[PDB]
Design a binder for this molecule. Structure first.
Ligand SMILES: *[C@H]1[C@H](C(=O)Nc2cccc(C(=O)Nc3ccc(Nc4nccc(-c5cccnc5)n4)c(C)c3)c2)C(=O)CC[C@@]1(C)C(=O)OC
Length: 354
């Protein structure tokens, strides 16, 4: 009727006719999304088909939180929801949900592959921090920030795709994805998390841009942990005291590593080196990496302090950072699970009232 369908993109995508030339743009995301052009809105847009949101309890919780949060967040550095629709009209036969958002040219991983410069690097970091701080203002901690989770346009405008892992992780159900390369020590040591955990992830991403590869490539759960202390160094006594005993021992037992200094971990050679300023801005970068890639989260830099750091403060504009806090509509119980049929009705009602 007012919907048209295409089998291109490996499934029968049904969409309004305003979106046309649907083409696959999937390259690793937990979702198969396709690119499109809207006639009503001049801009080309990207559309996602959510396969069986109510298929299990885990799928629904991810979809329900994404839809409610995307609808109630307005930030330049966080992806926004243009329109949500479902081809089916009946709740009883309701099976699929489509999401349209501002199309971006590539993910941060692809942009990392191209060697960049301090001005573009500082700008990507500045935006990532503003998105995280905007999330923290509403009480949201991501803990799953990765370069495949970050999307960029050709003008270097950065946006964040997903809203992380909600409340809780090294072994998660099929809806979610487990990426350890950028996880903090606390999440890998069960210590507990506060808002500065996301600061650790950006430090691994920032270092990855400079180094050109994953900072801590761990084949498994605990090889990840060995890589962190192998280069950053063995933790100090006050930190290992508070860990629960079954894991405190593994820490005290593993071979002690002095750890390399950031100066040799991130030497000037890879950085731009002809300019003194380029070397100086490198000096501003290495200290920032020293202040966020800290195992004791209590002594790790805060999101607010990172924004006013010399490497990041040049771009400080209150519109991006000091934006009005986001308020979530039916979040009071956003920490609770329910029946699949009840799960099914709520997602339909969140899409059917827009
Ligand atoms: C990074 C890297 C890798 O495989 N990435 C990669 C390789 C090839 C192609 C693409 C790609 O298509 N990127 C791409 C294209 C278009 C868009 N646009 C877009 N706009 C809005 C929304 C979405 C979207 C939403 C949900 C789900 N998907 C997309 N897309 C985007 C965002 C991206 C990417 C490697 O080869 C190494 C592996 C990897 C993944 C890495 O991180 O290694 C550390």
């Amino acid at each position: 009727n007012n919907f048209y369908s295409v089998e291109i993109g490996d499934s029968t995508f049904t969409v309004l006719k305003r979106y046309q030339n649907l083409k696959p743009i999937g390259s690793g995301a937990q979702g198969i999304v396709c690119a499109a052009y809207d006639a009503i809105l001049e801009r080309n847009v990207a559309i996602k088909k959510l396969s069986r949101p109510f298929q299990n309890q885990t799928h629904a919780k991810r979809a329900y939180r994404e839809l409610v949060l995307m609808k109630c967040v307005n930030h330049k550095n966080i992806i926004g929801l243009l329109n949500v629709f479902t081809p089916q009209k009946s709740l009883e036969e309701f099976q699929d949900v489509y999401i349209v958002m501002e199309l971006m040219d590539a993910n941060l991983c692809q942009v990392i592959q191209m060697e960049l410069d301090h001005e573009r690097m500082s700008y990507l970091l500045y935006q990532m921090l503003c998105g995280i701080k905007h999330l923290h203002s509403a009480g949201i901690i991501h803990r799953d920030l990765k370069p495949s989770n970050i999307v960029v346009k050709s003008d270097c405008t950065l946006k964040i795709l997903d809203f992380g892992l909600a409340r809780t992780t090294s072994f998660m159900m099929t809806p979610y994805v487990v990426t350890r390369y950028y996880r903090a020590p606390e999440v890998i040591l069960g210590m507990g998390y506060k808002e500065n955990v996301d600061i650790w992830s950006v430090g691994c991403i920032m270092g990855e841009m400079i180094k050109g590869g994953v900072l801590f490539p761990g084949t498994d759960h605990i090889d990840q942990w060995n890589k962190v202390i192998e280069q950053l160094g063995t933790p100090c006594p006050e930190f290992m005291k508070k860990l629960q005993p079954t894991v405190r021992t593994y820490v005290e037992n593993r071979p002690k590593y002095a750890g390399y200094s950031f100066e040799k971990l991130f030497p000037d050679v890879l950085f731009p080196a002809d300019s003194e300023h380029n070397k100086l801005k490198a000096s501003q970068a290495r200290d920032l990496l020293s202040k966020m890639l800290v195992i004791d989260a209590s002594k790790r830099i805060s999101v607010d302090e990172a924004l006013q750091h010399p490497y990041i403060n040049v771009w400080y504009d209150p519109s991006e950072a000091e934006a009005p806090p986001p308020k979530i509509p039916d979040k009071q119980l956003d920490e609770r699970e329910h029946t699949i049929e009840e799960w099914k009705e709520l997602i339909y009602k969140e899409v059917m009232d827009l």
